[PDB]
Amino acid sequence: VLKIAKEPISMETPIGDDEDSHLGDFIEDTTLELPLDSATTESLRAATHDVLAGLTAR
């Protein structure tokens, strides 16, 4: 409840007491898949397709 009682803060507030940079300028996007993982997924898809091609038809 004590955690809930506090209100969210703006990103427009400066981080570090009036540095010309804002808080939101540092927030990392966690909903974006890393290109490393995307390349891994592409390679895995290619490998699985090749392996399935290595098996029989049915």
Partner: protein, 618 residues
């Protein structure tokens, strides 16, 4: 508020359009590097090129997946390092200064792997970056796609940008240490080992110097083969004896074939070396110019190190008349103050007279100091003493123009003279001491005002220059060369400029690189020496100088009939080449940068009574 921003739109351009595949680090000198390359630390190279490393590792099959390649590169095994060398070998990288004032603020270089953590920058290029190695940080960008790699190699490359975009004279000019080395190597003494010798080739000169059988500078007759570009562009080998010095012959060894020997047979300051590079580029081309610039850098550094040029405490010799001049000027200002109490002279006139007296005293002190330092050497040639250029080191850096001008040395060895107080008024009593005779408390407190004013002026002028160059870029944004030629006989009447009473900018410099708008006749006979509208290179300027025509009509961009752009001719030639501008070049942006970048350098009787012509003419 999210749309409206400064400077410009935030997310789009500034602030700030962050970019991937980039690094940043402190820069150091790269005195072994070639001009077309720069030192890049191994760690930054590895981190920057991780996708390339993965690609090549999977290509040669040392890793079966991207994840395995990632494990290999984070383990930093010796295997990935050869891959890294391979990917770096041809890939050029862009080096960027923290502030970018003109297009030379970003230049391509071939990265060279170095153990360490700082980017090694070519010493010749730091002048363009306006970067001094005092903690300046530069950024590195990686042009990814093949088109971008090629684009960087063709345009971004340092060797392709040896000339400033604001003026044809080279921007990669030897600056301070190399200039000092060249000057010491070419400056002649009055007596030294091995004078009067006869030598064939500069190779014997280098042999004699390195063996210690002669001195670096000594009057010697040497047989040298100078090559002259003549006839149709063919080398003319002329072998004869020149009276020169050993250091000059050693330098001539470096100079590529095709230049007159007279260019090096002289004391070489900053101006001399810059002119020599300009002549080399105009006569030979690009590749000889780059090779010669690199070789002259190496030679200058080597012979500066061998020079042992050092600034001591004795190489600011105080002029002997400093006390006498100071005491005299004190006497006259005391007399003027006494007369002011008598009411004979007004306060303003008294102040002006005191200021003039102190200015005269300062000039006398500076002249005496310069006479003392300039010809300090009095050594005899064979027994007869003679007055010639001093071996004094501070006089070498003053004369060669490496660092420190006459005004600079004036505050060191003479007296630093008048300055100003708040309200910007010149102080009645100047500083009678210099930095070799330590300033007392009060005079230092006085100098503090000048220091504060200078620093605040630099800050405010930098901000104002940034705003100005932004506005220039805005107005000149959309302008681009869209046509090779439009066809127009309009233009501007072009003359050497004379403001006041004397010419300060001749016709040739203002017309060099311009296109003719009218076939101007000779000042005498009505003969056309300049054909229909054509680019004016150095040969045409020389022809115009020989037959001195008062005015030339020149196709200006303003009179160009092209719409949605300008024709190539109406612009000129200036870029990084002596050839006409290429269609598609954005002249607006280069012009805006050219006018904006020097903005940080901007910190600002017989007249109307009787006209006195200084020379004899009609």
């Amino acid at each position: 508020d999210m749309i409206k921003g400064k400077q410009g739109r935030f997310r789009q351009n500034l602030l700030g359009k962050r970019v991937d595949y980039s690094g940043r680090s402190v820069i150091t000198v790269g005195p072994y590097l070639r001009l077309h390359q720069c030192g890049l630390p191994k760690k930054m190279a590895l981190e920057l090129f991780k996708p390339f490393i993965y690609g090549k590792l999977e290509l040669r099959g040392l890793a079966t997946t991207i994840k395995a390649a990632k494990k290999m590169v984070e383990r930093e095994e010796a295997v990935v390092w050869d891959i890294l060398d391979e990917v770096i070998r041809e890939h050029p990288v862009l080096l960027n200064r923290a502030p970018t004032l003109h297009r030379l603020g970003i230049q391509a270089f071939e990265p060279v792997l170095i153990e360490g953590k700082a980017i090694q920058l070519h010493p010749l290029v730091c002048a363009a970056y306006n970067a001094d190695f005092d903690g300046d940080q530069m950024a590195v960008h990686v042009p990814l796609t093949l088109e971008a790699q090629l684009e960087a190699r063709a345009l971004m490359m340092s060797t392709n940008n040896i000339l400033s975009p604001a003026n044809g004279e080279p921007i990669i000019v030897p600056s301070q240490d190399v200039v000092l080395g060249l000057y010491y190597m070419t400056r002649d003494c009055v007596n030294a080992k091995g004078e009067g010798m006869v030598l064939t080739g500069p190779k014997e000169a280098e042999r004699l110097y390195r063996s210690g059988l002669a001195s670096l500078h000594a009057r010697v007759k040497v047989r040298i083969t100078e090559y002259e570009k003549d006839a149709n562009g063919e080398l003319v080998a002329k072998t004869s004896l020149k009276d020169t010095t050993v250091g000059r012959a050693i330098l001539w060894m470096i100079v590529p074939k095709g230049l007159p020997y007279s260019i090096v047979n002289q004391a070489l300051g900053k101006k001399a070396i810059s002119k020599m590079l300009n002549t080399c580029y105009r006569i030979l081309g690009l590749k000889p110019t780059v090779i010669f610039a690199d070789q002259i850098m190496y030679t200058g550094f080597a012979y500066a190190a061998r020079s042992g040029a050092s600034v001591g405490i004795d190489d600011m010799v105080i002029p002997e008349k400093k006390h006498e001049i100071i005491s005299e000027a004190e006497a006259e200002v005391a007399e003027i103050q006494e007369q002011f109490q008598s009411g004979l002279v007004t306060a303003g006139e008294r102040y002006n007279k005191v200021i003039d007296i102190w200015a005269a005293a300062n000039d006398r002190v500076s002249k005496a100091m310069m006479d003392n330092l300039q010809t300090e050497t009095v050594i005899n040639r064979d027994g007869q003493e003679e007055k010639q250029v001093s071996f004094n080191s501070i006089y070498m850096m003053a004369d060669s123009g490496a660092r420190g001008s006459a005004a600079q040395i004036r505050q060191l060895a003479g007296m630093r003279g008048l300055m100003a107080k708040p309200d910007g008024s010149i102080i009645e009593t100047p500083i009678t001491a210099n930095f070799r005779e330590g300033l007392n408390v009060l005079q230092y407190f006085i100098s503090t005002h000048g220091a504060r004013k200078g620093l605040a002026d630099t800050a405010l002028k930098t901000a104002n220059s940034g705003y100005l160059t932004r506005r220039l870029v805005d107005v000149a944004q959309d302008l681009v060369v869209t046509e090779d030629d439009c066809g127009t006989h309009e233009g501007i009447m072009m003359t050497p400029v004379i403001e006041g009473g004397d010419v300060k900018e001749p016709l040739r410099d203002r017309v060099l690189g311009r296109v003719t708008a009218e076939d101007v006749l000779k000042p005498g006979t009505a003969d056309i020496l300049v054909p229909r509208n054509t680019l004016l290179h150095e040969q045409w300027c020389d022809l115009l100088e020989e037959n001195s025509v008062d005015a030339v009509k020149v196709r200006s961009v303003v009179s160009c009939d092209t719409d949605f752009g300008v024709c190539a001719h109406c612009y000129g030639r200036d870029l990084a080449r002596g050839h006409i501008i290429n269609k598609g070049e954005a002249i607006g942006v280069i012009a805006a940068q050219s006018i904006g970048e020097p903005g940080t350098q901007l910190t600002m009787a017989a007249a109307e009574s009787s006209i006195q012509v200084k020379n004899k003419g009609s």
